[PDB]
Design a protein around this motif. Sequence first.
Motif, PDB file in Angstrom:
ATOM      1  N   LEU A 105       0.872  -1.183   0.000  1.00  0.00           N
ATOM      2  CA  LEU A 105       0.000   0.000   0.000  1.00  0.00           C
ATOM      3  C   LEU A 105       0.900   1.220   0.000  1.00  0.00           C
ATOM      4  O   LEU A 105       1.773   1.348   0.873  1.00  0.00           O
ATOM      5  CB  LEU A 105      -0.906   0.016   1.239  1.00  0.00           C
ATOM      6  N   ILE A 106       0.733   2.085  -1.003  1.00  0.00           N
ATOM      7  CA  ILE A 106       1.518   3.309  -1.103  1.00  0.00           C
ATOM      8  C   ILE A 106       0.685   4.526  -0.662  1.00  0.00           C
ATOM      9  O   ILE A 106      -0.329   4.841  -1.287  1.00  0.00           O
ATOM     10  CB  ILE A 106       2.024   3.570  -2.537  1.00  0.00           C
ATOM     11  N   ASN A 107       1.098   5.172   0.427  1.00  0.00           N
ATOM     12  CA  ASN A 107       0.383   6.336   0.990  1.00  0.00           C
ATOM     13  C   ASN A 107       1.121   7.629   0.688  1.00  0.00           C
ATOM     14  O   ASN A 107       2.338   7.713   0.897  1.00  0.00           O
ATOM     15  CB  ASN A 107       0.274   6.218   2.512  1.00  0.00           C
ATOM     16  N   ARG A 108       0.395   8.638   0.204  1.00  0.00           N
ATOM     17  CA  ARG A 108       0.955   9.970  -0.013  1.00  0.00           C
ATOM     18  C   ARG A 108       0.293  10.991   0.924  1.00  0.00           C
ATOM     19  O   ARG A 108      -0.949  11.140   0.947  1.00  0.00           O
ATOM     20  CB  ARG A 108       0.788  10.417  -1.462  1.00  0.00           C
ATOM     21  N   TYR A 109       1.125  11.689   1.692  1.00  0.00           N
ATOM     22  CA  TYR A 109       0.637  12.667   2.659  1.00  0.00           C
ATOM     23  C   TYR A 109       0.987  14.062   2.225  1.00  0.00           C
ATOM     24  O   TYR A 109       2.166  14.416   2.199  1.00  0.00           O
ATOM     25  CB  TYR A 109       1.291  12.471   4.024  1.00  0.00           C
ATOM     26  N   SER A 134       9.234   4.964   5.395  1.00  0.00           N
ATOM     27  CA  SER A 134       8.907   6.390   5.340  1.00  0.00           C
ATOM     28  C   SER A 134       9.819   7.067   4.352  1.00  0.00           C
ATOM     29  O   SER A 134      11.023   6.810   4.354  1.00  0.00           O
ATOM     30  CB  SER A 134       9.126   7.078   6.705  1.00  0.00           C
ATOM     31  N   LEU A 135       9.255   7.970   3.556  1.00  0.00           N
ATOM     32  CA  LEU A 135      10.035   8.739   2.582  1.00  0.00           C
ATOM     33  C   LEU A 135       9.556  10.185   2.541  1.00  0.00           C
ATOM     34  O   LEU A 135       8.350  10.458   2.610  1.00  0.00           O
ATOM     35  CB  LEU A 135       9.905   8.130   1.191  1.00  0.00           C
ATOM     36  N   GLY A 136      10.499  11.113   2.416  1.00  0.00           N
ATOM     37  CA  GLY A 136      10.127  12.522   2.287  1.00  0.00           C
ATOM     38  C   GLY A 136       9.981  13.227   3.632  1.00  0.00           C
ATOM     39  O   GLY A 136      10.812  13.059   4.538  1.00  0.00           O
ATOM     40  N   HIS A 159      12.804  10.585   6.701  1.00  0.00           N
ATOM     41  CA  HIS A 159      13.104   9.996   5.407  1.00  0.00           C
ATOM     42  C   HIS A 159      14.009   8.759   5.528  1.00  0.00           C
ATOM     43  O   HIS A 159      15.147   8.849   6.031  1.00  0.00           O
ATOM     44  CB  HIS A 159      13.770  11.069   4.527  1.00  0.00           C
ATOM     45  N   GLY A 160      13.520   7.611   5.052  1.00  0.00           N
ATOM     46  CA  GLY A 160      14.338   6.400   5.021  1.00  0.00           C
ATOM     47  C   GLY A 160      14.140   5.488   6.224  1.00  0.00           C
ATOM     48  O   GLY A 160      14.607   4.351   6.224  1.00  0.00           O
ATOM     49  N   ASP A 161      13.448   5.983   7.245  1.00  0.00           N
ATOM     50  CA  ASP A 161      13.172   5.177   8.423  1.00  0.00           C
ATOM     51  C   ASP A 161      12.226   4.028   8.068  1.00  0.00           C
ATOM     52  O   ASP A 161      11.266   4.202   7.319  1.00  0.00           O
ATOM     53  CB  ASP A 161      12.479   6.007   9.507  1.00  0.00           C
ATOM     54  N   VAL A 162      12.495   2.856   8.618  1.00  0.00           N
ATOM     55  CA  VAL A 162      11.631   1.703   8.386  1.00  0.00           C
ATOM     56  C   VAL A 162      11.176   1.181   9.713  1.00  0.00           C
ATOM     57  O   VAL A 162      11.982   0.985  10.643  1.00  0.00           O
ATOM     58  CB  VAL A 162      12.350   0.546   7.647  1.00  0.00           C
ATOM     59  N   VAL A 163       9.879   0.946   9.809  1.00  0.00           N
ATOM     60  CA  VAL A 163       9.315   0.409  11.036  1.00  0.00           C
ATOM     61  C   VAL A 163       8.738  -0.965  10.739  1.00  0.00           C
ATOM     62  O   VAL A 163       8.065  -1.143   9.723  1.00  0.00           O
ATOM     63  CB  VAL A 163       8.206   1.334  11.576  1.00  0.00           C
ATOM     64  N   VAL A 164       8.991  -1.928  11.622  1.00  0.00           N
ATOM     65  CA  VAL A 164       8.512  -3.282  11.436  1.00  0.00           C
ATOM     66  C   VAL A 164       7.819  -3.739  12.708  1.00  0.00           C
ATOM     67  O   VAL A 164       8.370  -3.612  13.819  1.00  0.00           O
ATOM     68  CB  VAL A 164       9.670  -4.275  11.169  1.00  0.00           C
ATOM     69  N   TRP A 165       6.609  -4.247  12.569  1.00  0.00           N
ATOM     70  CA  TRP A 165       5.968  -4.852  13.721  1.00  0.00           C
ATOM     71  C   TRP A 165       5.346  -6.200  13.378  1.00  0.00           C
ATOM     72  O   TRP A 165       4.918  -6.438  12.247  1.00  0.00           O
ATOM     73  CB  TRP A 165       5.002  -3.881  14.427  1.00  0.00           C
ATOM     74  N   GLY A 166       5.326  -7.093  14.350  1.00  0.00           N
ATOM     75  CA  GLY A 166       4.813  -8.427  14.134  1.00  0.00           C
ATOM     76  C   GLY A 166       4.812  -9.172  15.448  1.00  0.00           C
ATOM     77  O   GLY A 166       5.111  -8.593  16.493  1.00  0.00           O
ATOM     78  N   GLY A 167       4.474 -10.457  15.399  1.00  0.00           N
ATOM     79  CA  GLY A 167       4.407 -11.254  16.620  1.00  0.00           C
ATOM     80  C   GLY A 167       3.498 -10.569  17.622  1.00  0.00           C
ATOM     81  O   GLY A 167       2.369 -10.193  17.290  1.00  0.00           O
ATOM     82  N   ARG A 191       5.018  13.518   2.096  1.00  0.00           N
ATOM     83  CA  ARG A 191       5.570  12.303   2.636  1.00  0.00           C
ATOM     84  C   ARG A 191       4.953  11.108   1.901  1.00  0.00           C
ATOM     85  O   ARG A 191       3.761  11.110   1.592  1.00  0.00           O
ATOM     86  CB  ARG A 191       5.266  12.202   4.143  1.00  0.00           C
ATOM     87  N   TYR A 192       5.770  10.097   1.613  1.00  0.00           N
ATOM     88  CA  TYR A 192       5.245   8.810   1.169  1.00  0.00           C
ATOM     89  C   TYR A 192       5.527   7.765   2.206  1.00  0.00           C
ATOM     90  O   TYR A 192       6.526   7.832   2.930  1.00  0.00           O
ATOM     91  CB  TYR A 192       5.889   8.340  -0.143  1.00  0.00           C
TER      92      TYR A 192
END
Length: 201
Positions: A105-109, A134-136, A159-167, A191-192
């Motif tokens: 899913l690509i989100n534009r803010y 996260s981008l922008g 910009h460039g941060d990646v968040v991962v959640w699971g379990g 922001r994307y």
Amino acid sequence: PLAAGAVILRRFAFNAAEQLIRDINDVASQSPFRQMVTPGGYTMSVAMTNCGHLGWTTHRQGYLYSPIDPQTNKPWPAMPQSFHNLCQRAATAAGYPDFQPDACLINRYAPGAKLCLHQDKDEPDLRAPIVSVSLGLPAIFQFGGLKRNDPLKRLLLEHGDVVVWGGESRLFYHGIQPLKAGFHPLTIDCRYNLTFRQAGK
DNA sequence: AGGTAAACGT
DNA sequence: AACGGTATTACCT
Ligand SMILES: O=C(O)CCC(=O)C(=O)O
Ligand SMILES: [Mn+2]
């Protein structure tokens, strides 16, 4: 760490970002960004599109991961290799080496756009993590718990941060506070976010 | 039985 | 402006 089973990888996608952004533009050339209308009749502030086999969409009777873009009546564009490769690296670093997404899913803010607290929980196989890139422009990300009123952590995502959640944290409520106006060299004025899921079997 | 939509006032 | 009500229901399957 962010939570049980959750991590932020700061600037993880910084090096990949330019290619990711060329690829967002390519996807949107086929399935354009659109602000979806909720079942309740309200137009969302975030503009969206999808790639991969399955795309998140609203319809009159709820939400749906569908193989077909309801606006174009064609399949969503294929998931770009750049997307798939970044996702795989991020998931591995976050301790989810076996993740196989089938949906992005690509989100534009634009300024003011937000995503009220919600849970990702309509994927049939909740064993798989969410990988969120996260981008922008920077945004305040809210990350809570299993209940809507569980205390929120508020984290600036840059910009460039990646968040991962699971379990244990897979079903936690999360959201984005209204975006502040600003400038970014790569996205100019927005922001994307790329959200990777395994949405089908 | 259970799933699940949800994006205004204080 | 952070927090929480609302779905405390009305429908589907
Ligand atoms: O934009 C973000 O960081 C979060 C997006 C999100 O929660 C989603 O796409 O479901
Ligand atoms: Mn989400």
